Design a protein around this ligand. Structure first.
Ligand SMILES: O=c1ccn([C@H]2C[C@H](O)[C@@H](COP(=O)(O)NP(=O)(O)OP(=O)(O)O)O2)c(=O)[nH]1
Ligand SMILES: [Cl-]
Ligand SMILES: [Cl-]
Ligand SMILES: [Cl-]
Ligand SMILES: [Cl-]
Ligand SMILES: [Cl-]
Ligand SMILES: [Mg+2]
Ligand SMILES: [Mg+2]
Ligand code: NA
Ligand code: NA
Length: 326
DNA sequence: CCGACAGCGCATCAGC
DNA sequence: GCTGATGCGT
DNA sequence: GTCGG
């Protein structure tokens, strides 16, 4: 992290614009800049040098100069002082609580971990489980623990139906030595863009994992997406492992590649690729890549047999998962 | 200038 | 009950 | 907040 100082400042500023200002476009702007600077292979020496990178303009260039001279940013110094901003920002750290509920809670006088705890009757299901595991969800997952969780998920999935295919994506598939959570892509031959021959496909898996005490709680659950909690089992006399966030996405088997491409990310890489796709005249989502007609309407699905085919369509050299961490 | 900024599943609400 | 708009995480 | 046309 050659420019750790600047990317943090930019990230903080982005968190502030989304959580407090509820100005999402500014949030993304800062996030892009932090991303492009994060990969810049030199230790930035000036705002001007930074403004050369795409995504960094006059304002951010200005901020980088203020940051390099003093080692800080006045705009953030003040923001840290403002009690309201500090509270809203803190509450958004509880999973399920976003910018609106955060400001709403503060309006009601609920602004500290302690406040939330005594007002559990004022949170929806997700916010409650999010508070329950506030601490745990802040901790990273060592890859080694990820490999162990993978064994359970894949082996438990095989026991349900040998035809299920569970692939761990997210930062794990990109090769990170630590993940914020485990992301699992699930496919089965009975569920395709053509037909759903078997109901309760995701449920069956969720059920099997709950039976073995892997899945402990559920944030939200539908027929194709599951957002919950899981925990690696521990040995006798062994301290327990922290509770971990788990996302499971059931995708039509004939749409695996657009699915695995999406779920591997990162989120910004996807954004950059989906933007570039548009400029090339295509639209990409987790299910397919379609062309864009003059009218501006998406056409029918283009055939895909590998992730690379999708890169080829938009004229981008193939990039391995490890190089998509933007 | 100024429109565009990736795309969408699930929970929850309002209006009916 | 439904559909649509919004919040949230994604 | 930044960008392309
Ligand atoms: O806004 C989003 C969030 C996620 N995604 C994709 C890319 C991301 O890698 C994947 C999994 O989502 P996570 O929130 O789990 N992120 P990731 O696994 O990359 O990082 P982390 O280690 O924080 O979980 O879903 C998007 O496309 N858009
Ligand atoms: Cl904005
Ligand atoms: Cl600062
Ligand atoms: Cl596909
Ligand atoms: Cl589609
Ligand atoms: Cl998702
Ligand atoms: Mg993840
Ligand atoms: Mg996830
Ligand atoms: Na620039
Ligand atoms: Na949150």
């Amino acid at each position: 992290t050659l420019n750790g100082g600047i990317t943090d400042m930019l990230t903080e500023l982005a968190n502030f614009e989304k959580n407090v200002s509820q100005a999402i476009h500014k949030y993304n702007a800062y996030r892009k800049a932090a991303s492009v600077i994060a990969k810049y292979p030199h230790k930035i020496k000036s705002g001007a040098e930074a403004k050369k990178l795409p995504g960094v303009g006059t304002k951010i260039a200005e901020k980088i100069d203020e940051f390099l001279a003093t080692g800080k940013l006045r705009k953030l110094e003040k923001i840290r002082q403002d009690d309201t901003s500090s509270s809203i920002n803190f509450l958004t750290r509880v999973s399920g609580i976003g910018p609106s509920a955060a400001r709403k809670f503060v309006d009601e006088g609920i602004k500290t971990l302690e406040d939330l705890r005594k007002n559990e009757d004022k949170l929806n299901h997700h916010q409650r489980i999010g508070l329950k595991y506030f601490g745990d969800f802040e901790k990273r997952i060592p890859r080694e623990e990820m490999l162990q969780m993978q064994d359970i998920v894949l082996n438990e999935v095989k026991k349900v139906d040998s035809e299920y295919i569970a692939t761990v994506c997210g930062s794990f598939r990109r090769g990170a030595e630590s993940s914020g959570d485990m992301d699992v892509l699930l496919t089965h031959p009975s569920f395709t863009s053509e037909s759903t021959k078997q109901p309760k496909l995701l449920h069956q898996v969720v059920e099997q994992l709950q039976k073995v005490h892997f899945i402990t709680d559920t944030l939200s659950k539908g027929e194709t997406k599951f957002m919950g909690v899981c925990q690696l089992p521990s040995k006798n006399d062994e301290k327990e492992y922290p509770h971990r966030r788990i996302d499971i996405r059931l995708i039509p088997k004939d749409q695996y590649y657009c699915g695995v491409l999406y779920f591997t990310g990162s989120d910004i890489f996807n954004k950059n690729m989906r933007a570039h796709a548009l400029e090339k005249g295509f639209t990409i989502n987790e299910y397919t890549i379609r062309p864009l007609g003059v009218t501006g309407v998406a056409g029918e699905p283009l055939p895909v047999d590998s992730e690379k085919d999708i890169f080829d369509y938009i004229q981008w050299k193939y990039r391995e998962p490890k190089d998509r961490s933007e």
